Design a protein around this ligand. Sequence first.
Ligand SMILES: [K+]
Ligand SMILES: [K+]
Ligand SMILES: [K+]
Ligand SMILES: [K+]
Ligand SMILES: [K+]
Ligand SMILES: [K+]
Ligand SMILES: [K+]
Ligand SMILES: [K+]
Ligand SMILES: [K+]
Ligand SMILES: [K+]
Ligand SMILES: [Mg+2]
Ligand SMILES: [Mg+2]
Ligand SMILES: [Mg+2]
Ligand SMILES: [Mg+2]
Ligand SMILES: [Mg+2]
Ligand SMILES: [Mg+2]
Ligand SMILES: [Mg+2]
Ligand SMILES: [Mg+2]
Ligand SMILES: [Mg+2]
Ligand SMILES: [Mg+2]
Ligand SMILES: [Mg+2]
Ligand SMILES: [Mg+2]
Ligand SMILES: [Mg+2]
Ligand SMILES: [Mg+2]
Ligand SMILES: [Mg+2]
Ligand SMILES: [Mg+2]
Ligand SMILES: [Mg+2]
Ligand SMILES: [Mg+2]
Ligand SMILES: [Mg+2]
Ligand SMILES: [Mg+2]
Ligand SMILES: [Mg+2]
Ligand SMILES: [Mg+2]
Ligand SMILES: [Zn+2]
Ligand SMILES: [Zn+2]
Lengths: 211, 102, 55, 91, 69, 51
Amino acid sequence: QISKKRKFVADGVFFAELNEVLTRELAEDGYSGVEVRVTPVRTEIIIRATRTQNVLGEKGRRIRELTSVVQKRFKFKENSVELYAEKVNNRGLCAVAQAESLRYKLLGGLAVRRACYGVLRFIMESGAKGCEVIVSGKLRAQRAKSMKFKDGYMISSGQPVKEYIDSAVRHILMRQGVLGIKVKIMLDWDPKGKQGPTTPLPDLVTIHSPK
Amino acid sequence: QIHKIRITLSSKNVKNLEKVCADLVRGAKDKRLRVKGPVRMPTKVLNITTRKSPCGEGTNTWDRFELRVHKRVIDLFSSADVVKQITSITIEPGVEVEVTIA
Amino acid sequence: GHSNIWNAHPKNYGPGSRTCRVCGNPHAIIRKYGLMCCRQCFRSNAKEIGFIKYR
Amino acid sequence: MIISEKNRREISKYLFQEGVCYAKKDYNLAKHPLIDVPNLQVIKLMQSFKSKEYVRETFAWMHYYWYLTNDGIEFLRTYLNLPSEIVPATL
Amino acid sequence: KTYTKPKKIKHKKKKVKLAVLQFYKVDDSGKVQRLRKECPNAECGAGTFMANHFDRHYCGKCGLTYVYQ
Amino acid sequence: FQRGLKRKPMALIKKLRKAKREAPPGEKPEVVRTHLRNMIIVPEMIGSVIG
RNA sequence: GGAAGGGCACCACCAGGAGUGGAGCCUGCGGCUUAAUUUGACCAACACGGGGAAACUUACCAGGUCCAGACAUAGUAAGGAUUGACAGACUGAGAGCUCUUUCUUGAUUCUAUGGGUGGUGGUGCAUGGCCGUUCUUAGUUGGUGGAGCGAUUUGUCUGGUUAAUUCCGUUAACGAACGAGACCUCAGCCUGCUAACUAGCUAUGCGGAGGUAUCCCUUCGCGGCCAGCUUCUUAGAGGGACUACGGCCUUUUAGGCCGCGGAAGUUUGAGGCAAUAACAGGUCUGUGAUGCCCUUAGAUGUUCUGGGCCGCACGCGCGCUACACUGAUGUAUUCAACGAGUUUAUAGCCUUGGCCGACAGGCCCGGGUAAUCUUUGAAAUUUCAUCGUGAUGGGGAUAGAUCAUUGCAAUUGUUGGUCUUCAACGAGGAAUUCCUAGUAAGCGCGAGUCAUCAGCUCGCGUUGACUACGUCCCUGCCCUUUGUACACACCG
Ligand SMILES: [K+]
Ligand SMILES: [K+]
Ligand SMILES: [K+]
Ligand SMILES: [K+]
Ligand SMILES: [K+]
Ligand SMILES: [K+]
Ligand SMILES: [K+]
Ligand SMILES: [K+]
Ligand SMILES: [K+]
Ligand SMILES: [K+]
Ligand SMILES: [Mg+2]
Ligand SMILES: [Mg+2]
Ligand SMILES: [Mg+2]
Ligand SMILES: [Mg+2]
Ligand SMILES: [Mg+2]
Ligand SMILES: [Mg+2]
Ligand SMILES: [Mg+2]
Ligand SMILES: [Mg+2]
Ligand SMILES: [Mg+2]
Ligand SMILES: [Mg+2]
Ligand SMILES: [Mg+2]
Ligand SMILES: [Mg+2]
Ligand SMILES: [Mg+2]
Ligand SMILES: [Mg+2]
Ligand SMILES: [Mg+2]
Ligand SMILES: [Mg+2]
Ligand SMILES: [Mg+2]
Ligand SMILES: [Mg+2]
Ligand SMILES: [Mg+2]
Ligand SMILES: [Mg+2]
Ligand SMILES: [Mg+2]
Ligand SMILES: [Mg+2]
Ligand SMILES: [Zn+2]
Ligand SMILES: [Zn+2]
C-alpha cells in the first residue's frame, strides 16, 4: 500500500541487496549475475554462474537452502519465491566471470603477467572486439604500481559505452595487501541481441551494394 | 454484467510499457470491447544529487541521479472474467499490472 | 550492564537512531524515498538500484 | 556466553527444523524475528556453532546467513534426541 | 594511564558447604521438619525457602519480601 | 511541570527533604550531590546545600 | 627561458555590470583559553569532510557499568563452576557497581595457558576503490615500410581552414587504434498521428446576478461515460535544420561573412559521457575493503551520566542584512516552475475545511500511498495614501519582561510570537572575484540535512539589463623554431 516511488526504490534496493548477498555467498562457485522476475503471486530469481553444479549442490540442497534463507530474510511468502541456476552463455564475454577467474588464478600463486595475458587471450578468442585488464596494488615491492594489458578495440566516451562495454571490479586479499583487478570487455554488434547490443555504433554507416 | 475495469500500468522502461499497453488494447479490441486510453500520466522523475567524492577534498562535484517512473491508465467496459482473461497474456519483467473496478 | 542502564538512552530520533542499511555507518544517510543508504554506499549501488545519470 | 537451556533448545530446534537462519546485526533487539530468543543470544550461539564447523556463516548488508552442515546436522540430531529419520526441511 | 583509587573487585558469591542441609531437620522417628518458611508464590512452588533476615523474610526466586515486627 | 517530572527529580527532592530533616537545629543541611543540571529550583528547596 | 613565430581562455585582459575588500551579524579556519574545547584538509584547505554536534552522532574530557573474551587443553566443581536478587549502606543514580544480611539458579560459566574478537586507534609515504588536479585544452599510441650505430625519429606535416590532430591538401610513408565529433538527457517548432471522468476547450440544458428583465445581451455555478472535440494540459510515435537557398571572399578545395525565409542559422541552447601518462594531491573518520604496528578486561571494545566540539584581547575565507525617496511603512491589487508527502494505532507524513485565539498556537470533522487531496498553490512588482533628507517612520545589532511549540531534557537564550531598547553603518584604501542573453543582478519558491533549527548546498521559476563580440598587455594554455651547464626538471 506504499506509493509508486517508494515501491520502485524498494525494488531496486532489494535487487542490489540480493546481488550482493549472492556475490558474497557464491564467490568461489562463480556468480555472473542475478535476474528477478515478478509474476502474479510468484517471483522468479535466476542465478547465473559458470558452475551451476556447485550452486545447486547434490540434489539441489544448496539451492534449496538459498531459497529458504532468501524467503526468510526478505519476508517472502512461503512457496512464493524460487531460485533457478542457469548457464552463462559465452562466459568469456562476461566481465564478472573473467574478473573472478583472474582472482582465482592470482590467489593460486600464478604470475600476474601470465594470468592477465591468458585472460586477455581467452576473452579475445571468445569473440570480444577488445578487452582491457588492469592490476593495481603492491606488486613485487612495497611501492604500489599498476599493470595494464590491452588488445583490440575499445571506446570510453559517450552513450554507446553503457551498452558496448561490459566492466567489473574485484578485490583480491593477498598476504601483503589488497590487489585491485579491473576487467573491461568491449562487445560486438549482434542483430539478434543475445551476444551483443542490438544497435549499431553511432558513427558506423553501411552502404548496400548496388544491383 | 458490464463494468468499467480500470487497469494501471507502471514501469521504468518506456518500450516495454508501451508494448504491453498496445497488446492489452489489441486484445480488448479483438473482443469488440470498448477501450478508453491508454492515458499517460506525467512522468515521475525521482532525483538524487550526491557529491562524487567519498570525502571532502577537491572541487565539489555532484552526480545527478534520476529514476523515471512511467504510469499508464486503461479503462475497459466489460465483465471481470473477460478482463482477467485478457490480462493473462504474457507480461515482460519491469511492468506492474493492477486491475480494479472504478 | 544492568538492563535498566545498558543501552537505556532513548534512540527514537536523531543521527544515532539511523544507520546505513549497507554499511551501518550513521553519517550522510540518504532518507529520500526510503533508501536509507549512506551517500557513499548509494553512489556505489546506484546503477543496481536503478538510478541513471542523464545530466 | 550464558544462555538459558530453553533458549538454546529453541534455537537448535529451529535451526535443525529449517536448516537455515538469518539475523540482523542488532545486538540489542529484544527478540529475533523468527525465534522468541533475543537476537544477541541467537547471533552468539550461531557464532559458537560456526567456530567448531557446525555451520557456514555469510555476512552482507548488515545481516547474517547461516547454513547447517553435515557435522552440524549430526550434532543437532544427537543433542535434540531426534530419530535419525527426521532431517532438516532443506533436504 | 594513572589510577587514583584502588581497583574495585567484582562480587563473588560466598561458598556454603551445605546450605540445603540446614533447611531441614530429621527426627529419630523419621519425620522431617523445615526450619525455614516456604514462599507462598505458586511460581516458586513448594521446596523454595525464604531467607531469615534480621527484620524480614526474603525469597531468592521471586524477590517477595515479608517484614515481621 | 505540565509534562511531568521523571523519577530522578522526585528522588532528588526526597533526598533534599531527608537532608533538611536530619540537619541539627540552627545548622545547615549536609551536602546532596547530583548530576541533574536540568532540575528546576522550587521554593521547597530554599536553604538546601547542593553539589 | 625577463627567446622568436602562430593560435587560444571572462577560473586572462579589454569595454562594462554586480560586486568583495570598509560596518553589524551568520558560518568555516588560525591563535588564545580550557579537563576537554576531538580531528582531516593549507589555484587543487578554509557554508569542505554532504560537518546545520542539546542527548545519540563523538572520535575529546570527568566519572560508573558490562563482555557482546568464539574454540582447544588443564584446574575447580552437583558435598555445587557459577548466575540473579528483597531490605540497609554506598552511589550522580530503583547500576546487587560494591559491602552487610542470605535466599535463588544449575555446568550454560569461573580460573590459567594458546588462540581469537572489536577498535571514528597510528600508518593515505604500505594499499584497493572512489574522487580532485595536471588539462577544457586537443591531445595520445601500435603494425608494416623509410632514416639513424644508438637513445630516438617519420607517420602525427610547409600552407589554408576548424571549437577540435576538424578537414582540404602536401607528402617516405601506407594503413589503422584511442581522444574530438558522432552519441544520450532536457528545452525550443508541429492547429499534422494515437489517446485521455486522475487534463481541458466548445455548444447545449438548468439555475443565480445584472442589463430592455420573459423572448435578447453580459457574467458566474451545476450535470450529460450516448453532445462534440483535442487549440489549450499530459506523453508515446514521428516530422523538422542540412548552412538548405541567394550575394560576396577563399586554391575550381576545405571553408568563412552577410542576407530572405524559418520555431530555430554561434556545434540551435544547456548538460551527461570523456584518451595516454601522472601526483608519494584527499580519503584507513563511508564500507563485515585491507597489509603491518598498537591496545584488547583497571580495555584505545561497548554502554550509562555529565560536560565539550559553540568557550574569546586578536587575524583571515564564503556569506546574510544595510547605508535609503529608483525608498520605508499601511492599504488595494494578482501572475510561476522544479518538487515532496502516512504504521492509521483516537493518531505517525502533506494537510484542506469549521471553531477558539491579537499573535504564537490549540480543538474538531475529514482528503491524499497521489495529474484524484495539500495544490483554489510566492515575492520582487503593480496600485493609492502617510513619511520629507532629519541616522529620520533608514538600519536592526545588543538587551529586558513575558507567552507558546519540538523534544526524555531547551541553562550556555533550540526555534517561533508580543511590548520595549534602538549599536556600527552616510557607499567602503591598497587589493581582489564572477559574468557575453532570458545571461548578470534583484525576487521569491521546492528538496537535502530535519523530533525541533538554513544566513548553506542542490534545483526551480518571476522581473530583466549595461557593455563587447576583440587582443595577447597581465595571468595562463596549445603548436612550431631556437638556447640550455636543468632531468628532484627554474620552487632547477
Ligand atoms: K564591500
Ligand atoms: K568549500
Ligand atoms: K589512493
Ligand atoms: K614505425
Ligand atoms: K588500516
Ligand atoms: K557515511
Ligand atoms: K598572453
Ligand atoms: K593549438
Ligand atoms: K646560449
Ligand atoms: K635538449
Ligand atoms: Mg569515440
Ligand atoms: Mg564527446
Ligand atoms: Mg582571477
Ligand atoms: Mg576588467
Ligand atoms: Mg565585510
Ligand atoms: Mg576549535
Ligand atoms: Mg586549473
Ligand atoms: Mg556521551
Ligand atoms: Mg555529545
Ligand atoms: Mg570506541
Ligand atoms: Mg595519497
Ligand atoms: Mg621503424
Ligand atoms: Mg613523434
Ligand atoms: Mg494538442
Ligand atoms: Mg600525501
Ligand atoms: Mg565545528
Ligand atoms: Mg563555496
Ligand atoms: Mg496564481
Ligand atoms: Mg531609526
Ligand atoms: Mg525599519
Ligand atoms: Mg544545532
Ligand atoms: Mg553544511
Ligand atoms: Zn553505507
Ligand atoms: Zn518466591
